[PDB]
């Protein structure tokens, strides 16, 4: 079943035994309806052709990592309707299962609906003289408006509604974008994917302003922080998001996106007593 744990902001769905071709089921098609908000995660464990009783299983859309079924109808890149979404689709060669994780961005501008179909109707198992076919499961997902824009820096110009600062990048730019945030306020940035992001996988490592811009892992500065990152989405952009909660130590750090002719620095100051 699909369950949303309101405490972890995570919706988990397991679509394996519901579509197995070895078990008997009343309904050939079952529907799940889930509503998500900004920063929620959707984790779906589903099978592959390599798992017994799922030899002819398939997903719709086939490119599940990049696409959804917009309006339960046509297969579209999720980046087009949910700007800034982050998807991963990782295979487990032991259990023959795949895990799909969708991160809703820290702000959603437009209410959206889409669906995903896990179709095992073509797989079959032989029991005695009977041939039993697998079944189908559909997930209908709804995303609400995102409440607040990210106090951050869009260096691409393509995420103007997602960030408080957004500017198209010209040659010979050398811009520094400053941000002060308190607890439970999102920051982040977007760059061209071919630009060089320094340090590696910001904010996973950052230049610590307090210690002479030395490179440090973020978790060697705070364990009261959540982050996410995508190196290259389907539109060719790099994005990173960060948020603190219940962190009392003050922080000051930065990161850079640099091409052969331009530099873009984001400088974040986290003050646990800053009031907007």
């Amino acid at each position: 079943i699909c369950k949303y744990d309101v405490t972890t902001k995570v919706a988990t769905c397991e679509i394996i035994d519901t579509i197995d071709s070895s078990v008997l089921k009343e309904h050939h098609t079952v529907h799940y309806s889930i509503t998500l908000s900004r920063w929620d995660k959707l984790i779906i464990k589903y099978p592959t052709n390599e798992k017994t009783h799922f030899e002819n299983f398939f997903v719709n859309p086939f490119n599940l990592k990049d696409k959804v079924l917009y309006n339960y109808n046509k297969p579209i890149n999720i980046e087009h309707i949910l700007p800034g979404a982050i998807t991963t689709d990782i295979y487990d060669t032991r259990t023959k299962i795949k895990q799909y994780i969708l991160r809703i961005p820290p702000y959603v501008h437009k209410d959206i609906h889409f669906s995903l179909e896990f179709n095992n109707s073509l797989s079959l198992t032989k029991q005695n003289q009977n041939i039993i076919y697998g079944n189908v499961a559909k997930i209908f997902i709804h995303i609400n408006q995102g409440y607040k824009e990210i106090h951050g820096c869009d260096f691409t110009g393509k995420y103007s509604h997602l960030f408080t600062y957004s500017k198209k990048p010209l040659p010979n730019d050398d811009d520094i974008c400053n941000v002060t945030i308190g607890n439970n306020t999102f920051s982040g940035f977007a760059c061209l994917s071919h630009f060089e992001l320094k340090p590696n996988n910001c904010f996973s490592s950052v230049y610590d302003y307090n210690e002479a811009n030395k490179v440090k892992k973020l978790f060697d500065l705070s364990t009261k922080v959540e982050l996410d990152h995508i190196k290259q989405n389907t539109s060719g952009y790099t994005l990173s998001y960060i948020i603190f909660n219940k962190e009392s130590t003050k922080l000051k750090f930065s990161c850079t996106c640099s091409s052969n002719y331009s530099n873009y620095t984001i400088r974040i100051t986290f003050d646990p007593n800053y009031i907007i």
Epitope: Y107, H109, Q145, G146, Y147, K148, E149, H151, G157, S160, H161, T164, Y165, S166, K167, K168
Partner: nanobody, 123 residues
């Protein structure tokens, strides 16, 4: 956001209040950052306030910080400016304006679309 129209504007005491509204009948109002400017007699038009498209992030000018409040209803496609503790220098023609984000901070000019303006007098 093509059609912007203000409502409100009159006379107040030297410590009273007034409230301006700005309406746009167009759906794309949802996508524009909203703002208020004022122009005094024979003075360059100055920035008053601005609110983001989400309605959650506001930015005020130092001249009005602490007395003026901006907000918006995206369903009705309206925005409002509650002006309290009005002062004789606050006398001006107030216009509302919308801008598509980009080119820097969201609240920073240039603003794209404008209204016709409503007069506000205090004494």
């Amino acid at each position: 956001q093509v059609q912007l129209q203000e409502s409100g504007g009159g006379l107040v005491q030297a410590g009273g209040s007034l409230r301006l509204s700005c309406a746009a009948s167009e759906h794309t109002f949802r996508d524009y950052a909203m703002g208020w400017f004022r122009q005094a007699p024979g003075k360059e038009r100055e920035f008053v306030a601005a609110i983001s498209w989400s309605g959650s992030i506001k930015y005020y000018a130092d001249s009005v910080k602490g007395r003026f409040t901006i907000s918006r209803d995206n369903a009705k496609r309206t925005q409002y400016l509650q002006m309290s503790s009005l002062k004789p220098e606050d006398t001006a023609v107030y216009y509302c304006a919308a801008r598509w984000p980009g080119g820097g901070m969201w609240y920073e000019p240039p603003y794209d679309y404008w209204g016709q303006g409503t007069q506000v007098t205090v004494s």
